[model samples]
Target: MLTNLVAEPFAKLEQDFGGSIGVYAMDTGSGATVSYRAEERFPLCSSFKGFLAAAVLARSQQQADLLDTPIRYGKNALVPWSPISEKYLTTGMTVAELSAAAVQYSDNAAANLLLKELGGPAGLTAFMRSIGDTTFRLDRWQLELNSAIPGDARDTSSPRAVTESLQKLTLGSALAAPQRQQFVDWLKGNTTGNHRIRAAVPADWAVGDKTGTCGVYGTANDYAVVWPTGRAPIVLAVYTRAPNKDDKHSEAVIAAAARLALEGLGVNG
Candidate 1:
């Protein structure tokens, strides 16, 4: 089903943006998949929080009461470039709420809080390994971790690996049914990516996704599980790394890739 979706469409779009780009799209139920440079790794930016949330869910399943744990944040934890920190400074929130903010708002403070709850990067990486995705690295925190690590390589994943990870989530290989639903709910409410993958689909289509952007000279990525009414769900991960950080052109490339995926897969909704 995906054979016709050759690299030309995506390659042309990538050339227009003058950046490195990778795309993977799949229909889980039908076992149809398509890719363009899907095996190459790209910085994950904040999209790693999606997996972080799943890892937390995995840990919560083992501990039973982890989700309800209360976590209070002080002014000291606040970091720049976080909407959650800007609004909820010096406040307390539950693990569930923090996970939501991490996914929905890409809140840097909330992500760090959840990472701590998961016992830091080592903890999250252990969980990722447990799930059989050793290549999915969780090496740093959000805004703070960016500077600690080398340029844009802190957290990275290939489009193929990310697509498999999302499939694992959907097939109940990563998080349990209940926890998976909760994670999907949080993604459905995500405030980012409206202009990218979501813009290419019909209004009624349901898209649960995470969006990430590393300042100019880095990456812009979106990984989504799209439900088009009666059709099978489509899992797509698009990544673009550019020499210029704040380029709107990269986002357009992502949107175009999404549109091409939908058209190729015969999902118009």
Candidate 2:
């Protein structure tokens, strides 16, 4: 699967780094294929934002049947360590804007808001489990560390689960077309937290992904889709952690690693 787009970088990365990497690719013209670490779980970081996105739309769709449904907001709704809630300084926002903020900025507050609407931690977990994402076990909406307050486990998902979840999004497997379109569009607008997957792509390329970083582990997580019009589409999920002060180093290394694997698999640069 990944061999069709970029493979060399990924293979070299695996040779050097102990962490696992996985790739699952499908093309309308080519049928189905798989390349993966499919079994091992990794810290999903902000890449889990995609699941929150799904939960939001799923919950919203239940009541409003519309993406534009308005959700009430106030200082009480804010989540810890997020910039968007503070930046907006608002009372209420439409579902559209919340969805935008969730993926576009990887906003913790926005994700919490969605999590709350989806019936809290247990509710979102149920939603995910309903879809066969058993490997994805998260207790809260916030990033891993903060979510750890209730316990010690960090948010986790297998490389296979992460890739499969996104592939589901791309193929209209769960959401309606309108909702799916909103997801792809919102993801395309993602602009912050550029270190891993974001660093691998050309500056001008159309990329839509999110990054998650934790100060404690110096771990960086990234998941994204690269749309190179004339070439086949590429979707990537990378995770890295190191015992150091510099988080960017890990992100850059993972990005470079992914590119290396891509090259090894026969995808052209």
Candidate 3:
């Protein structure tokens, strides 16, 4: 009965948007949930940058100065959407800077460069496994991994897995205290999520999120952790896709789905 209350709105929203929608929301305080096609796979797009940065932070736990080490990349390294890294072409940037650029700006060049530092896609996948996330996968580098082929499972994760892993990393004990707070702070500063989950959250509450857009297949997604005053936080993920390559992704749809998820959890947003 309760699931249909949320799932019905999600069906209408997806039909109106001419795409498929997936959402998973949980009220950590009460363990209440709302799920709609939540197990379905959707392209990760640039959203993988968030996990990539987390992987680097995990490595820093051992290397001590790993985040401060500067890396220089030639012109060949720069790619589309590299807002921060492109500015530092001559001077280079620290691993911390690259991670911040990757998350806050969705900088393609910074993501690719960081992937190399992690020994490519396989290494990142390994890190996910270490953290007990079986559903997340990174089979290609940034940009290439953004491909949203209908049945290609290469760079996809279910909304449920994304939310679960996010809860573990950000709100749970998966990361050490210093590193955990650092990850939260970085997410809190993300620049690309204003129109997605962020739009659905109230101004008085605390929120942090990461956004992804494949620029194809009407594919886009967002995952967020929201804190309402005097309550345990709520964590949720919303992902969307359309059959046609040129079908547009609607930020409005993402926001609407987020609204329903919060409603389903009975969270006053």
Candidate 4:
């Protein structure tokens, strides 16, 4: 059951800046759901990377042992890494490297590279469909920019669906048991992208999640499923259009929203 452990924190937040906010929480195992305006849409942002992560592994596994496959970059496929647009990377990298950067660093170059390698945006879309992702639709593939795909380009999913997807991954149902574990490892090894909800969590806690930030002006959106080391698990999603892009403000919202979501799941700490 979702707990009220977060009432104190959320109440403080609501008293401070109360505005349009949406949240959803659930236990992956029980399928129980809770949300506030969850159907409201927001950009999936980097959180969509998780689906790509799953699809890339799924595609590579179909070809050979993903762990040992030798993948090289093509001219069109090799997009410039944002952090190092003119640095190295001239020499080709492995499939594993691309996956690692795409998820861990949110490396735009690596993400676009994988998108191109997997037969373009059409292919990524087809891949997601094959894997049973029904909550939202991915936009077109941009090999160079790695920007959101447009169309009904907006990505919107109920918090329940997101946690269910993670639960499937944890259960070895995403791709294969071994591949799923590999994805989890890549996630655990993530080096960037956890600026908000994750700030308050202990460094040693086995927290596994991805964040999505989008919406215009004051809109803010985030979703995460943290595996607490000491209490009942929490799968939380927060969506906001906070207008302000200040990292600190976003982190505050994440901290407050997550604090409430987890407490609802019966967590004490």
User: Number of clashes in every candidate structure?
Assistant: 3, 19, 0, 18
Per-residue lDDT for 1-269 in model 1, tens only?
44555434777777877877888888777776778888877878888888888888887888888888878778878776578655766568778878888899988888888888788887877777787775677677666443312235557778988888887886545788999898889888999889888888788888888998876554688999888888678888988786654544367778888888777666655
Ranking by lDDT: 3, 1, 2, 4
Write model 4 residue lDDT over 135-184, tens digit each, in one string.
65556543212232232334445454555566566543667877887777
TM-score of candidate 4 versus the correct structure, residues matched by position? 0.77
Give per-model TM-scores: 0.90, 0.79, 0.97, 0.77
**lDDT tens string, model 3, 198-220?**
99999999998989999999999
Model 4 off-target regions past 4 Å? 1-19, 29-32, 65-81, 84-88, 142-156, 214-221, 230-232, 242-249
Q: Which candidate is the best by lDDT?
A: 3
Off-target runs (Cα >4 Å) in candidate 3 are 1-8
Better of 1 and 2 by lDDT: 1
**Residue 194 in candidate 2 has what lDDT?**
68
Q: What value does the lDDT take at residue 202 in candidate 3?
A: 94
